[PDB]
């Protein structure tokens, strides 16, 4: 792909984070803490899952960023509407305002309803995410495998401003403590 020149500097929005997340001083890394991180509750925080949003809101144009997922066993990545549900249980789907892929139990899947199996021969250590607002496209790229395409959502009905979306996943296994990191331009 040739999307690198649409690179945007994403930072994480602390106020949206699940109360167990630890976001770095530079707001570029996030991992699961082993306890509540001593913050007040608010209506923005994701309550049920270890999720956080980017601070940036996109309503036009082409945007590209990269995320490091080295040594994680589970995570979700993509974009979502600014008005997605924060509290309680929900599935990641375009009907609920999410355009995402994930790793879970040694398989990669796109967050369609129902979910779609991905075909990845080289497990990625870094993921590239491309959004074309006007075209209604969200695409995912395998940076470890020379930028190969992972998945394209097309005919997207965003129906609102978009925010970068992250889930570091639970760490029940003791093998999923590693952070998500926003990679430099
Ligand atoms: C305290 C702790 C435990 C496990 C992992 C980390 C972490 O930041 N990952 C390593 C890295 O910086 O690449 C921190």
> Structural domain boundaries of the chain?
4-134+149-177
CA of 166 to the centre of ligand 1 (A): 17
- Name every residue whose Cβ is closer than 8 Å to that of residue 180 and which is 6 or more positions away in sequence: 29, 30, 31, 67, 68, 69, 72, 75, 77, 166, 168
96: exposed, middle or buried (Cβ count in 10 Å: 0-12, 13-18, 19+): middle
| Whether the CB of 55 sits within 6 Å of ligand 1 | no
This entry's atomic model was obtained through X-ray
Find the helix or strand (DSSP H, E) in which 158 lies.
none
| Whether the CB of 177 sits within 6 Å of ligand 1 | yes
Peptide bond into 118 cis (omega under 30): no
Q: How far apart are CA 55 and CA 180, in angstroms?
A: 16
Q: How far apart are CA 39 and CA 7, in angstroms?
A: 32
Q: How far apart are CA 90 and CA 33, in angstroms?
A: 22
4-134+149-177 has which CATH code?
2.60.120.920
The number of the ligand 1 atom at minimal distance from the alpha carbon of 70 is 13
Query: In 3D, which of 160, 99, 98, 149 has the Cα closest to residue 120?
Result: 149
Q: How far apart are CA 40 and CA 94, in angstroms?
A: 30
Number of H helices, E strands in the chain: 0, 13
Query: In 3D, which of 70, 66, 73 has the Cα closest to residue 50?
Result: 73
Pocket test for ligand 1, best of 179, 181, 183, 184 (most atoms within 8 A of CB): 179
Query: What's this structure's resolution in Å?
Result: 1.2
| Whether the CB of 179 sits within 6 Å of ligand 1 | yes
CA of 39: how far to CAs of 15, 17, 129, in Å? 9, 10, 30
């Amino acid at each position: 792909h040739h999307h690198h020149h649409h690179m945007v500097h994403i930072t994480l929005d602390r106020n949206t984070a699940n109360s167990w997340l630890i976001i770095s001083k530079d707001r570029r890394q996030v991992r699961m803490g082993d306890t509540h991180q001593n913050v007040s509750d608010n209506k923005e925080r994701f309550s049920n899952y270890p999720m956080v949003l980017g601070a940036q809101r996109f309503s036009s144009g082409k945007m590209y960023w990269e995320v490091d997922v080295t040594q994680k066993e589970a995570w979700d990545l993509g974009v979502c509407r600014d008005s997605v549900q924060r509290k309680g249980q929900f599935s990641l789907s375009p009907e609920n305002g999410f355009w995402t892929i994930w790793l879970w139990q040694d398989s990669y899947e796109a967050g369609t309803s129902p979910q779609t199996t991905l075909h990845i021969q080289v497990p990625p250590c870094q993921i590239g995410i491309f959004v074309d607002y006007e075209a209604g496209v969200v695409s995912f790229y395998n940076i470890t495998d020379h930028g190969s395409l992972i998945y394209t959502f097309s005919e997207c009905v965003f129906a609102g401003p978009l925010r970068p979306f992250f889930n570091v996943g639970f760490n029940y296994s003791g093998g999923n403590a590693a952070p998500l990191k926003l990679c430099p331009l």
